[PDB]
Design a protein around this ligand. Sequence first.
Ligand code: VO4
Ligand SMILES: [Zn+2]
Ligand SMILES: [Zn+2]
Length: 382
Amino acid sequence: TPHALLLISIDGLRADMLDRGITPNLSHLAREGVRARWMAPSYPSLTFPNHYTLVTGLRPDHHGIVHNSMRDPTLGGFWLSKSEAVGDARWWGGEPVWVGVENTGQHAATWSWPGSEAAIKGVRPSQWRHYQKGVRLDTRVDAVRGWLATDGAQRNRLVTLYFEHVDEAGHDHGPESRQYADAVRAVDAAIGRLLAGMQRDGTRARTNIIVVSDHGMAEVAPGHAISVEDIAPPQIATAITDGQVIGFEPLPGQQAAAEASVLGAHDHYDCWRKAELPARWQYGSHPRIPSLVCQMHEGWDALFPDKLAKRAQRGTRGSHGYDPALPSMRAVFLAQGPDLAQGKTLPGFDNVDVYALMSRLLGIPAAPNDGNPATLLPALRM
Ligand code: VO4
Ligand SMILES: [Zn+2]
Ligand SMILES: [Zn+2]
């Protein structure tokens, strides 16, 4: 029987948070195994795009999950709480690792990884669910522990686990807040309980473990929110998305007026025609990307006008979705297990490179991807 892979995502865990004395279990895991200095997200530095990049090895411009919120001429609208969009395979390009696993006759079990609610390339994981808010830490940990222990025809080569708590605390209170640190500690402790349970089950010694995040988190101090209609008024363009990556579609005949309003450098953002976006972001060819794309500067939000109004203007908040090269946006990568190196540190690298490692650890042929297989070869035990 080949070694299983446990893939854990801690949404919004910034790379530097491993070095603050608040992650005893993950710090121990990293010392036993391999730790990268940091892992850069792909553009845009948002949840759905990056989780899907992690499991496909494709940049969002290629896999088609180009934002958390999208429009498509054929498929219509997509956003995180539109279940029949999220569950519709036609949105999701490439081949995520769970599809690769199932196609070899092996099985995958997912606790709410973006894309796992669809039948991508026709293939669902063996275990999966519709993601719902407020599930207990023990509920998901005990499920994952179960899925790793299963034998016979329900044995799982791949098991995935996801935590939202650090991201949620970061948005509500900022990454330097006691709330963000408390969430980090809680998730770390839950992971400690999973590891101890795997050891009692005898699954620990035959399971490779990868812990990642999708992106980091930056502070958004009071007064750092504008309206998307400050960028372009609604009669000349429609804001398709708000937040930090702001897509605009000019109204009919209004392309020139929209460009006059939007293009170039502004106080706390910059905008480009999608074909002219900075080359380093490798983004803007996909048809689902709006004609005009604005990038908010680090620490600023641009909101739909009704949100800006209900934004309770008091305290410090957090956001991501900023330039992926920023230190604040850096994510985590660590790995440990029977097939992985021991007491190793790796340079910072791009998240597209994780897929090649996982495909090797899962015994699946690597689908074509945007990563470099060389990058994480040093993570292997030999
Ligand atoms: O769903 V996310 O782009 O806010 O961490
Ligand atoms: Zn996220
Ligand atoms: Zn977030």
